[PDB]
Amino acid sequence: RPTFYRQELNKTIWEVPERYQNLSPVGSGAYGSVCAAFDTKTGLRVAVKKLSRPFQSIIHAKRTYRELRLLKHMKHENVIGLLDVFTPARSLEEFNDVYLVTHLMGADLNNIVKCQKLTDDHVQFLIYQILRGLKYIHSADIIHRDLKPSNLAVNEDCELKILDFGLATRWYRAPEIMLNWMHYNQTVDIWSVGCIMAELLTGRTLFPGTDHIDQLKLILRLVGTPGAELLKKISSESARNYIQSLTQMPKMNFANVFIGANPLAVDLLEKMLVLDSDKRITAAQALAHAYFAQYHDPDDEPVADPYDQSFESRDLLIDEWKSLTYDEVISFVPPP
Ligand SMILES: COc1ccc(OC)c(CCC(=O)Nc2cc(-c3c(-c4ccc(F)cc4)nc(/N=N/c4ccc(F)cc4)n3C)ccn2)c1
Ligand SMILES: CCCCCCCCO[C@@H]1O[C@H](CO)[C@@H](O)[C@H](O)[C@H]1O
Ligand SMILES: CCCCCCCCO[C@@H]1O[C@H](CO)[C@@H](O)[C@H](O)[C@H]1O
Ligand SMILES: CCCCCCCCO[C@@H]1O[C@H](CO)[C@@H](O)[C@H](O)[C@H]1O
């Protein structure tokens, strides 16, 4: 029902509702392309993404559905959310293009830090928001699995949002991800938070590995070689035999590694950067840690509605994924 207009951008004809004005390209790639625009109806600067080849194949179609389902479900201040989704198509029969709209973002966490130490109050505020968003994401039984500064948008008021992309590196990955362990815990993301927090406090990458093996080597130097209780949980014969032939290394004294840091920050890092993922602090537990006393509000750290991910196991035809995607476009309700 909106009146659309057509304009050539990023070498295709974009067709968008007239509320979105002054489109200008900001990025592109195999996924599609993104324009900045001004949403006259809300007064917001927005990013409009036109998906590329959304229904070219079964895998493309399922990926399009997955992305729209995820963005429609995420409704939290510290997670990317969907302002709008539209298609110029008037029916399923002519449905070929998908456009997604969110807040225009212009800076990530790297841009805020610039290889400098942040003040402790500033670190508390940033890590607090990451953990608040992760509590929400994990409560939907979602694991990010590649959390890193480039996936963290931050505006001029230092308001932070978790993204599942970077704005137009393995240094933050949990060691079990590096080792193709599978059976991943949600605390793989807590490992990443610990790496980010350490860098914010010191102004230096915690584990700047040159390659995969070097990354693991640096990790074991800080946290020590696996202990007896962790070794009991390793089913891989080859992993055990390699680990048992390592020269033992104690866990370093984090208080001496992070000299000059808030001792409550050091305590929290010790609970995030644990090799055994079962012994890592959760996002909800971390929010209650004394380090965040000035920001923690147990009544404003919400959890997500249940997220039905059963579609992940299904093998459907292109036109079925396409019709399911069309249903999700039609049923979209814009946020307050
Ligand atoms: C670093 O400092 C900067 C300084 C100046 C700048 O300007 C030139 C910029 C760029 C501004 C910008 O890019 N802003 C922006 C982008 C997106 C967005 C969406 C997006 C998502 C959902 C929507 F509803 C709408 C857009 N998708 C995306 N990429 N997707 C990908 C990516 C990689 C993959 F491998 C796969 C997919 N991006 C980058 C969202 C919001 N703001 C940065
Ligand atoms: C200067 C450019 C302004 C673009 C405003 C786009 C508003 C898009 O929205 C339109 O606004 C009209 C205003 O009379 C309404 O009557 C239409 O129903 C509405 O769809
Ligand atoms: C809504 C954005 C925050 C939650 C993101 C959950 C992502 C679940 O899937 C994630 O998709 C990301 C994009 O493909 C990938 O970077 C991650 O590796 C993948 O695990
Ligand atoms: C030499 C490098 C050793 C890395 C050990 C990483 C141990 C991570 O921890 C393991 O994560 C698994 C899920 O991924 C869980 O099933 C295990 O119970 C847990 O111990």
UniProtKB/Swiss-Prot annotation:
One of its GO terms (molecular function) is NFAT protein binding. Changing residue 311 to L: Emulation of the active state. Increase in activity. One of its GO terms (cellular component) is glutamatergic synapse. It is found in: Cytoplasm; Nucleus. Brain, heart, placenta, pancreas and skeletal muscle. Expressed to a lesser extent in lung, liver and kidney. The modification Phosphothreonine is found at residues 12, 247. Changing residue 49 to R: Loss of kinase activity. Dual phosphorylation can also be mediated by TAB1-mediated autophosphorylation. TCR engagement in T-cells also leads to Tyr-307 phosphorylation by ZAP70. Dephosphorylated and inactivated by DUPS1, DUSP10 and DUSP16. PPM1D also mediates dephosphorylation and inactivation of MAPK14. Acetylated at Lys-49 and Lys-148 by KAT2B and EP300. Acetylation at Lys-49 increases the affinity for ATP and enhances kinase activity. Lys-49 and Lys-148 are deacetylated by HDAC3. Changing residue 30 to V: Lowered kinase activity. The modification N6-acetyllysine is found at residues 49, 148. Its cofactor is Mg(2+). It is an enzyme of class 2 (transferase). Belongs to the protein kinase superfamily. CMGC Ser/Thr protein kinase family. MAP kinase subfamily. Serine/threonine kinase which acts as an essential component of the MAP kinase signal transduction pathway. MAPK14 is one of the four p38 MAPKs which play an important role in the cascades of cellular responses evoked by extracellular stimuli such as pro-inflammatory cytokines or physical stress leading to direct activation of transcription factors. Accordingly, p38 MAPKs phosphorylate a broad range of proteins and it has been estimated that they may have approximately 200 to 300 substrates each. The TXY motif contains the threonine and tyrosine residues whose phosphorylation activates the MAP kinases. This is Mitogen-activated protein kinase 14. It comes from Homo sapiens. The lineage of its organism: Eukaryota, Metazoa, Chordata, Craniata, Vertebrata. The gene is MAPK14.
